[PDB]
From a paper:
Diphosphonucleotide phosphatase/phosphodiesterase (PPD1), a glycoprotein plant purple acid phosphatase (PAP) from yellow lupin seeds, contains a bimetallic Fe–Mn catalytic site which is most active at acidic pH. Unlike other plant PAPs, PPD1 cleaves the pyrophosphate bond in diphosphonucleotides and the phosphodiester bond in various phosphodiesters. Purple acid phosphatases (PAPs; EC 3.1.3.2) catalyze the hydrolysis of inorganic phosphorus from a broad range of phosphate monoesters and anhydrides in the pH range 4–7. PAPs are acidic metallohydrolases with the metal centre comprising an iron(III) ion and a divalent metal, which is either a zinc(II), manganese(II) or iron(II) ion.
The homohexameric organization of PPD1, as revealed by a 1.65 Å resolution crystal structure and confirmed by solution X-ray scattering, is unique among plant PAPs, for which only homodimers have previously been reported. The overall structure of the PPD1 subunit is defined by two domains: a sweet potato-like PAP domain, containing the Fe–Mn active site, and a previously uncharacterized N-terminal domain with unknown function. The N-terminal domain (residues 1–150) of PPD1 consists primarily of two β-sheets making up a seven-stranded β-­barrel. A 26-residue loop (Phe59–Pro85) joining β-strands 3 and 4 extends about 20 Å from the barrel and into the active-site solvent channel of the PAP domain. This extension positions the Lys74 side chain on the loop 10 Å from the phosphate-binding site and 8 Å from the Ser589 residue of the neighbouring subunit. Five disulfide bridges are present within each subunit, three of which are involved in positioning the structural elements that form the trimer interfaces. The solvent-accessible C-terminal end of each subunit (residues 583–589) is oriented by the Cys577–Cys582 bridge so that it traverses the adjoining subunit, protruding into its Fe–Mn active site and placing the side chain of the terminal Ser589 within 8 Å of the two metal atoms. Analysis of the crystal structure of PPD1 using the PDBePISA server suggests that its most probable quartenary structure is a hexamer, with an estimated dissociation free energy of 42 kcal mol−1 compared with 24 kcal mol−1 for the trimer. Previously, we identified an Fe–Mn bimetallic centre in PPD1, examined its oxidation state and demonstrated that it requires iron and divalent metal for its enzymatic activity. The crystal structure shows the active site of PPD1 with a phosphate ion bound to both of the metal atoms, similar to that previously described to be unique for sweet potato PAP. The Mn atom is coordinated by His434, His476, Asn345 and the bridging Asp312.
Residue numbers in the entry:
A (entry chain B): 20 to 590
B (entry chain B): 363 to 590
C (entry chain C): 249 to 590
D (entry chain A): 135 to 248
C-alpha cells in the first residue's frame, strides 16, 4: 500500500574522466513518515536483511549491506511528510562497482525496504583515482599511492612522470590489497566490508630538490590499451638542511564528512570540511601536511576510506600527506595493540597501513622518521608500547640521535595519543594529564636530544604548554622564546574535525593557551635561527595563538637539565 | 629540611637500613612484611633504590607472610591533592610508572604515603584503572594494589582538588591515622581513625587465601613450560 | 648466450607463489665417472625434478651442503654448471653448512674438518646472497607473501650473539598482514630431528639448537622452520618446548600456537638413518631423497608438499589456513604488553 | 688604501673535492660558489671519459655568522662562506674513468660552467 518508487538521474556518471558527479534522486511513498530515508548502496546489489548489532561499533542502520551514505526523505523537500514526494541531490565519488538507491520506512533503527532504484555507474568504475603523495625512504624519493579497480593480471600499473614540461619516464608500482578475512572483527569483517580495489605505490627517485614535477597514473591493459589519469603536479622537497622558507601543517583527528550534507556511519566530525577547506585555501603556502592519527573514523565501515582519499586529494595529490596511526586506525582487543579498545571497528590497522604509505621499516609498526629541509620529524605509534625497553623506544632514540642540528635545527616529535600534557576532562577524571605512562620514559629522550616541539592529536581541542620537563616550566615566556629553552614545548592539536572534547576545570601551572574549537597548526621555518608556530581556527583560517623561537646552533649545543654530554678534564 | 640534610633524622632514630643515609629498608611484623622507601632519593628503574625495592618485595614468603605493605613519604601512587593537580599530576612526577611494575609483579597489597595532609583511599588499581569494583569487602585476587594517603598525622591540612576521579573511593580533610589488623593468614582489616576522637570513619577488609596471591593477574604472571 | 628471468613480486603482493627448499644435494657426474667426494647418489634426480617442474617454481633455497667439494675445488664449477638450468632463470638462494665452512681454529662454531680446508671461501665467493657480511652468511630475503630468515649454523646462534640479534631483527621487521608466511632456514638442525646420530649423543637437535632461538620463533610466530644436514625428511607437529601445540596432521587452521619444524636434508647426499624412537611430535618420516615445495595461494592459504626426487610426486603435505587476526592473537610466550587504560 | 680588484666572476664554482659516498659505487663532489638556490640551480654534468654525459642535482648548504659558537669565528674572523653544493654520482662502474663539470643554471637561463 506504499506503492513507492525511487529513481536516479543521470545513470552514467563521470564523462570526460570526472570522478565526482551529482545525481538527483526522486521518490514517492503513498504512506509517508518523517522517519523515511534513502540509502546509497555500492555495489548496487545489496542485502536489506537485518544483521543485528554485535558490539558498540556496529551501529544503525543494522543492514547486512552497510550503505555508503544515507539521508532523510524530508531533507530538502520539506513538505515530504504531507506529500510523500521528494528529491535529493547527492554528490557521488567514483569508488568502483556501481550504485543503487533505496527508500525505507521506519527510521534507522527499524527500517523496512519499500523501493529500489535503477542502477547508476561511472563510465569507468576502475579508473585510477585519489593519488596521495608521501615522502619516501630518502630525501630525493617521493611516493605516489593511488587506488584502482585493476589487479595486476588486468593491467600493469605505472606512473609516468618527470620535470614540468621536460622528459617523462614510466616507473613501476607495487600493488597491494586486503580482503574481508584480513579484517579482525565487526563491522569491518561483516556489515561494513567493502572491496577496496587495488592500491598501487610508485617510487619517484633521483629527484632534484625544489624542482617542479608532473605525474600521471597509468594502467596498461593486457589488450594493449593504456588507461590514464589526468595530470597532477608537485614540487620536490628541499635537500635536508637547506635554507629556504618551509611551511608544515599539523593536526589530528580530522575525519570525514559529506559535502552534500548526507548522513553516514561515524558521522561525528563536524569540523572536518572546514579544516580541509582552510588547508586547500592556503595550499600555495603549505609544503607538507602531517595528519597525526584518527584519519577518517571509518571504524570498519570500509567504504569511507575511499571517501577520505577523495576528500584530501586536492591536498595530498600535490603535497606530501604524512600520516600517523591512532586508536581509530589500530585498536582491537587480542591483536597485539597496546590499547585493547574496540575503536578501529575491526580494522586492526589494515586499511590505514595499506591506503597510505609512510617510510616505516615495518608498515604494521607505523613509526618512522622523515625530513623536510630544516625540520626532522619523528613519528610514534601510540597504539603500540613506547616505554623504555621496547622496540619503539629504541627507534625513537635512534631517530632523535641521527639528526645534525646545525643543518636541521627544528626537531619535532609527533604522536596520536597524548604522551606529553593535556588538560582534557577524560584524562583528568582518571587522575592523569596524559595517557598513563605517556611521558615518563620518553621525556628522557625529548630532553636529552632537545626536541623543540612535541605534538599530539586524540584530544579534540588545542592546548599549548610552556617549555617543560618533569611537569615544571623551564622558561616563563608566553610567546617570544629566545635561546636555550631548557625544555620541550608540548601541543595538543587534535581539533582537526572530530567532536570537541571538554577541558577539565583545572588551569595548570603549565597550560598557556586552550581552545575548545576546531583548528590546526602551521610551523614556518624562516631560516636556521627562526621558527614560527601558528594555531589557526578551521572556521576562518585566522591565527588565534602563536609563538616564535629565535636561537642559534650554540643554544642547541648548550647544556640543559638532563641534557649535558660527558666531558674529559684532559686537554 | 632547613639545612639538616637528613643528619638529625638518621642519627636520632635507628632503622635497619644497610646505609642509614639512604634510609630505605625492609622489616617484618609476624604476617606483615614492610618495604620502606626514601622519596628524597631517586626511586626509578635503574637506581640503587629500585633494586632494593625489588629485592625486598621478592624475598617474602607469602604463604607465611601474606600481608605485603609498601611505605613511602611523598605520594608515588595516587593523590587528589590540589597541589599535585595544579602541576598536572595525581602523584609526584614519575612517582608510579616504574614502581607499579614491581607493585604489580610482587602483588603489593597496600601502598601508603604521607606528605599530603589528608586521607584518601583508592580502589585496587594498576595503570590508573580500577581492577576491582568493591568499596569495602575485598575477596580473593584483587588484581591491583590499594593505595592510601595517610599524611593527616598532624601538619596543617591540605585541600583536595575539585576533581573526583574514577579511583578515589574515600577522602577526609581532617587529621587521622590508619590501623591494620591481621586476624589470621586470610583476613586483614584496615581502619582509618580520626585523631579528634579515635573513632573509625573508613575501613575495608581483605579476605583471601594463599592461592589467590599465587594466581595470575595482569602483569603478574610467572613464566611456564609446556613440558610435564 | 641470452638468458631470461621473471622479476620477483612486490613484497606483500597477492599472486600464487612457489618456493622449493632442500639441503645437501651435492653433485655427481652425469657421465658416470668417479670423482672425489662422490657420495651424493640422489643429486641428479633432485636436479632433474626441479628442472622438470621449473615452470612452476619461482625461487629455490638450497640450505647448506652445496657441492661437497670439500677442498677438491674443481667441483665448484661442476656444481654451478649442474644447477645452471635452474639458477640461470630463478634465484638460487644459498645457506652455508658444515661442508662449506667448518675447519678447526678458524672461528667456526663447529671445529669439524668438513670443509676440507675451504673455510667458507668458495661458498662465499661462488654465490651471492644479500648478507651485510658475506663471511657471516646470515640474511633476510623476500618473495611476495613470504619472508625468509636464513641462519648460518656454523657460527654461534645463541642469545647474546651477533647472529641472534640479526635473527630477531629479521623476524621483527616483517609486516605479517602483507607478508604472512614467515620461514626460518638453517643448515644444521636447530629444531627437531630423530636422526640416529643426534639420538646417540642424547639429543633430537644440535646441542643448544632450539633453546634460545625458540623464544624468537614463538614471539614472532615463525610458521615453518626448515633444516638440512640430516639426509632424510621429517615433519613435526606445531611445537614449542618439546610439546605439540596443535593435534592436526594435515589441515592446520587458525592460530597454531607453535612453529612447524621440517627436516629436508634429503637433497642428494647419502641417506641418514633414523633412531628407533618414534617421538610424540614426529608426524612423518621418509628415508629417501626428496625436497619441499611451498605454495602460497593467497594471504590466508599456504601449502607444503614433500616430493620424492625419484619421481617428483607428493608423499607428504599440509595446509595452513589462517587470517591476519590469527597471527596477531596471543599464543604462549607470544603475547605483547598491554595497558589497562582506554 | 688601494683601488679595488675583483675576479671577473667572483661567484664562479670553485675548488671541488671528492669524497666516497654511502655505497661503494657512489662518489660525492662538493664545491663552493656564490650562487644560492634562488640565484641558480646547481648541478654536476658527468659521465664516462669521452662517453655520454648527464646532469645530476646538488644539495646546497651554508652557514652564517650566528652559527659560529664563539670568537674569533663569530666576530673578527667571520667571512661569508658562500654556498656549498654536493652532488652524488651514482651507479659507478668500478675502475672506470670519468669526467665532471660543475654547473649553475641562472634563472635568466644562462649556465655558468667550471
Ligand atoms: C581494451 O579493453 C578496454 C576495456 O573494455 C576497451 O575499452 C572499452 O571499449 C569499449 C568500446 O570498444 C567501450 O564501450 C568501453 O566503455 C571501453 N572502456 C574503457 C575503460 O575505455 C578497449 O577498447 C578500445 O577503447 C575503446 C573505448 C574504443 O576506442 C575501441 O575502439 C578500442 O579498441 C580495449 N582495447 C583494445 C585494443 O581492444
Ligand atoms: C616407528 O614408526 C613406524 C610407524 O609406522 C614404524 O615403522 C612401520 O611399522 C609398521 C607396523 O609396525 C610396518 O608395517 C611398516 O612397514 C614400518 N616401516 C615403515 C613405515 O617404514 C616403526 O616400527 C619399527 O620399524 C620396523 C622395523 C617395523 O617393522 C617394526 O618392527 C618396528 O617397531 C616405529 N618404530 C618403533 C620403535 O615403534
Ligand atoms: C524531518 O525528518 C526528521 C527525521 O526523521 C524529523 O526529525 C525528528 O523530529 C521528531 C519530532 O520533532 C523528533 O522527535 C526526532 O528526534 C527527530 N529525529 C531526528 C533524527 O532528528 C523532522 O521532524 C522532519 N521534519 C519535517 C518538517 O518533516
Ligand atoms: C565551519 O566554518 C563556518 C564558516 O566560518 C562556520 O559557520 C559560521 O559560524 C560563525 C560562528 O563562528 C557564524 O557567525 C557564521 O554565520 C557562520 N557561517 C558563515 C557562512 O559565515 C561553521 O560554524 C564551521 N563549522 C564548525 C562545526 O565549526
Ligand atoms: C583535637 O581533638 C579535640 C577533641 O576531640 C578537638 O576538640 C573538639 O572539637 C570538636 C569538633 O569536632 C568540638 O565539638 C569539641 O567541642 C572540641 N573539644 C572537646 C574537648 O571535645 C580538636 O578540634 C582537635 N584538634 C584539631 C586541630 O583537630
Ligand atoms: C633416481 O630416480 C630413478 C628414476 O625414478 C630411480 O630409478 C627407479 O627406481 C626404482 C627402484 O629401484 C625402480 O622401480 C625403477 O625401475 C628405477 N629406474 C628407472 C625408472 O629408470 C632411482 O632409484 C633414483 N636414484 C636414487 C639414488 O634414488
Ligand atoms: C644572465 O646573467 C649573466 C650574469 O649577469 C649574464 O652574463 C654577464 O653578461 C654581462 C654582459 O651583459 C657581462 O659583462 C658579464 O661578465 C657576464 N657575467 C657572467 C658571470 O657570465 C648573462 O649574459 C645573462 N644571460 C641572459 C640570457 O640575459
Ligand atoms: C589453539 C588455538 O587456536 N588457540 C589456543 C588458545 O585457545 C589458547 O588460549 C592460546 C594460549 O593462551 O593458545 C592457542
Ligand atoms: C581558566 O582560565 C581561564 C582564563 O583565565 C578562565 O576563563 C577559566 O575560568 C579558568 N578556570 C578555572 C577553573 O580557574
Ligand atoms: C637553562 O639551564 C641551565 C641549567 O643547566 C641554566 O643554568 C641556564 O642559565 C638556563 N639557560 C636559560 C637560557 O634559561
Ligand atoms: C566529590 O564527591 C563528594 C561526595 O559525593 C561531593 O561532596 C563533592 O561535591 C564532589 N566534588 C565534585 C567536583 O564533584
Ligand atoms: C583478575 O585477573 C584475571 C586477568 O588476568 C581475570 O581473568 C580474573 O578473572 C580476575 N580475577 C578476579 C578475582 O577479578
Ligand atoms: Fe579522534
Ligand atoms: Fe649433508
Ligand atoms: Mn584518538
Ligand atoms: Mn612532606
Ligand atoms: Mn651438513
Amino acid at each position: 500500500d506504499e506503492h513507492a518508487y525511487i529513481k536516479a538521474t543521470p545513470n552514467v556518471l563521470g564523462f570526460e574522466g570526472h570522478y565526482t558527479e551529482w545525481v538527483t534522486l526522486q521518490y514517492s511513498n503513498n504512506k509517508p513518515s518523517i522517519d523515511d530515508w534513502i540509502g546509497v548502496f555500492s555495489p548496487a546489489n545489496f542485502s536489506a536483511s537485518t544483521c543485528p548489532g554485535e558490539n558498540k561499533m556496529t551501529n544503525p542502520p543494522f543492514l547486512c549491506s552497510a550503505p555508503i551514505k544515507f539521508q532523510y526523505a524530508n531533507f530538502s523537500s520539506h513538505s515530504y511528510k504531507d506529500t510523500g514526494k521528494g528529491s535529493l541531490k547527492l554528490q557521488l565519488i567514483n569508488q568502483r562497482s556501481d550504485f543503487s538507491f533505496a527508500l525505507f520506512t521506519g527510521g534507522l533503527t527499524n527500517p523496512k525496504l519499500i523501493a529500489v532504484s535503477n542502477k547508476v555507474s561511472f563510465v569507468n568504475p576502475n579508473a585510477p583515482v585519489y593519488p596521495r603523495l608521501a615522502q619516501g625512504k630518502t630525501w630525493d624519493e617521493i611516493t605516489v599511492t593511488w587506488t584502482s579497480g585493476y589487479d595486476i593480471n588486468d593491467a600493469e600499473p605505472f606512473v609516468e612522470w618527470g620535470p614540468k614540461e621536460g622528459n617523462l619516464v614510466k616507473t613501476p608500482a607495487g600493488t597491494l590489497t586486503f580482503d574481508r578475512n584480513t579484517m579482525c572483527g565487526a563491522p569491518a569483517r561483516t556489515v561494513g566490508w567493502r572491496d577496496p580495489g587495488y592500491i598501487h605505490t610508485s617510487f619517484l627517485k633521483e629527484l632534484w630538490p625544489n624542482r617542479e614535477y608532473t605525474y600521471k597514473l597509468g594502467h596498461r591493459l593486457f589488450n594493449g590499451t593504456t588507461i590514464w589519469s589526468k595530470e597532477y603536479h608537485f614540487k620536490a622537497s628541499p635537500y635536508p638542511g637547506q635554507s629556504s622558507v618551509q611551511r608544515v601543517v599539523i593536526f589530528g583527528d580530522m575525519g570525514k564528512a559529506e559535502a552534500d550534507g548526507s548522513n553516514e556511519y561515524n558521522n561525528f566530525q563536524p569540523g572536518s570540511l572546514n579544516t580541509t577547506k582552510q588547508i586547500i585555501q592556503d595550499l600555495e603556502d603549505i609544503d607538507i601536511v602531517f595528519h597525526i592519527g584518527d584519519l577518517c573514523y571509518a571504524n570498519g565501515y570500509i567504504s569511507q576510506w575511499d571517501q577520505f582519499t577523495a576528500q584530501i586529494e586536492p591536498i595530498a595529490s600535490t603535497v606530501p600527506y604524512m600520516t600517523a596511526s591512532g586508536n581509530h586506525e589500530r585498536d582491537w582487543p587480542g591483536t597485539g595493540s597496546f590499547y585493547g579498545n574496540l575503536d578501529s571497528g575491526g580494522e586492526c590497522g589494515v586499511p590505514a597501513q595499506t591506503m597510505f604509505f609512510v617510510p616505516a621499516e615495518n608498515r604494521e609498526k607505523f613509526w618512522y622518521s622523515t625530513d623536510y629541509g630544516m625540520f626532522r620529524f619523528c613519528i610514534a605509534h601510540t597504539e603500540l608500547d613506547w616505554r623504555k625497553g621496547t622496540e619503539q623506544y629504541e627507534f625513537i632514540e635512534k631517530c632523535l640521535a641521527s639528526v645534525d642540528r646545525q643543518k636541521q635545527p627544528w626537531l619535532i616529535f609527533l604522536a596520536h595519543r597524548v604522551l606529553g600534557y593535556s588538560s582534557a576532562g577524560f584524562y583528568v577524571q582518571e587522575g592523569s594529564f596524559e595517557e598513563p605512562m605517556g611521558r615518563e620514559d620518553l621525556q628522557h629522550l625529548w630532553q636529552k636530544y632537545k626536541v623543540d616541539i612535541a605534538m599530539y592529536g586524540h584530544v579534540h581541542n588545542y592546548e599549548r604548554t610552556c617549555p617543560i620537563y618533569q611537569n615544571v616550566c623551564t622558561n616563563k615566556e608566553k610567546h617570544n622564546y629566545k635561546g636555550n629553552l631548557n625544555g620541550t614545548i608540548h601541543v595538543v592539536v587534535g581539533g582537526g574535525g572530530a567532536s570537541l572534547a571538554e577541558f577539565a576545570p583545572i588551569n595548570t601551572t603549565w597550560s598557556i593557551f586552550k581552545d575548545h574549537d576546531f583548528g590546526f597548526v602551521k610551523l614556518t621555518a624562516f631560516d636556521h635561527s627562526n621558527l614560527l608556530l601558528e594555531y589557526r581556527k578551521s572556521s576562518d583560517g585566522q591565527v588565534y595563538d602563536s609563538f616564535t623561537i629565535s636561537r642559534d646552533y650554540r643554544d642547541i649545543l648548550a647544556c640543559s637539565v638532563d641534557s649535558c654530554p660527558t666531558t674529559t678534564l684532559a686537554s
